[PDB]
């Protein structure tokens, strides 16, 4: 099984998170590809069994600037028969805490993809609690095979 993870990160918190999920999925025996959102087409997800987005949230528009194209292209795919999950970094200072995660979640649902595990929202940098959640997120997605 192949999981594709696509991330946006300006200061590294979301990339670490993406890398944490990827390391775990690899240790569980999956093929995994990790890409920066600017370098890849959303349609590469058609080739994977699991599609994952890792995003931060930035301002009232929520989506990072660089993620916009990818979001719009994702929203045009049919991903019935794929499994998806969403993770993110934000800042609990905002009531719109990890909103871009909820945005990607509802776009995924539109595509026909089946949610594989609850989405994980991380407050700034990841610490131990974030790690057991992200670890569980990966265990649960591997289990749906
Ligand atoms: C100008 C600005 C606006 C932000 N707005 C939000 C927000 O609305 N919601 C949220 O959860 N976090 C918000 N954040 C927090 C960032 O998403 C957080 O700093 C995150 O760790 C950045 O991810 P990165 O390190 O992968 O670039 C904002 C940060 C900045 C600098
Ligand atoms: Ca790649
Ligand atoms: Ca469209």
Residue numbers in the entry: 2 to 146
Please quote the paper that reports this structure.
Flavodoxins are electron transfer proteins that participate in a variety of reactions in prokaryotes and in some unicellular algae. The identification of flavodoxin as an essential protein for S. pneumoniae infectivity and the fact that flavodoxin is not present in humans open the possibility of using it as a target for the development of novel and specific antimicrobials against S. pneumoniae. According to its gene sequence translation, it contains 147 residues and very likely belongs to the so-called short-chain flavodoxins characterized by the lack of a 20-residue loop that, in the long-chain flavodoxins, appears intercalated in the fifth β-strand. Either structure shows the archetypical α/β sandwich flavodoxin fold (5 α-helices that pack against a five-stranded β-sheet with a 21345 topology, forming an α/β/α sandwich).
To understand the molecular basis of the interaction of the FMN cofactor with the protein moiety and to provide a structural frame for the identification and characterization of SpFld inhibitors, we have solved the crystal structures of the SpFld in the apo form and in complex with FMN, at 2.18 and 1.69 Å, respectively. Overall, the holo (note that the holo form contains selenomethionine (SeMet) residues) and apo SpFld structures are similar with an r.m.s.d of 0.8 Å. The main differences between the two structures are traced to two of the three FMN binding loops encompassing residues 10–14 (phosphate loop), 57–66 (50’ loop) and 92–100 (90’ loop), the latter two sandwiching the isoalloxazine moiety. A further noticeable difference is the presence of a small 310 helix stretch at residues 38–40 in the holoprotein that is absent in the apo form. In its bound conformation, the FMN phosphate group forms hydrogen bonds with S10 (sc), M11 (N), T12 (sc and N), N14 (N) and T15 (sc and N). In the holoprotein, FMN is embedded by Y59, D92, E97, Y95, C99 and G60.
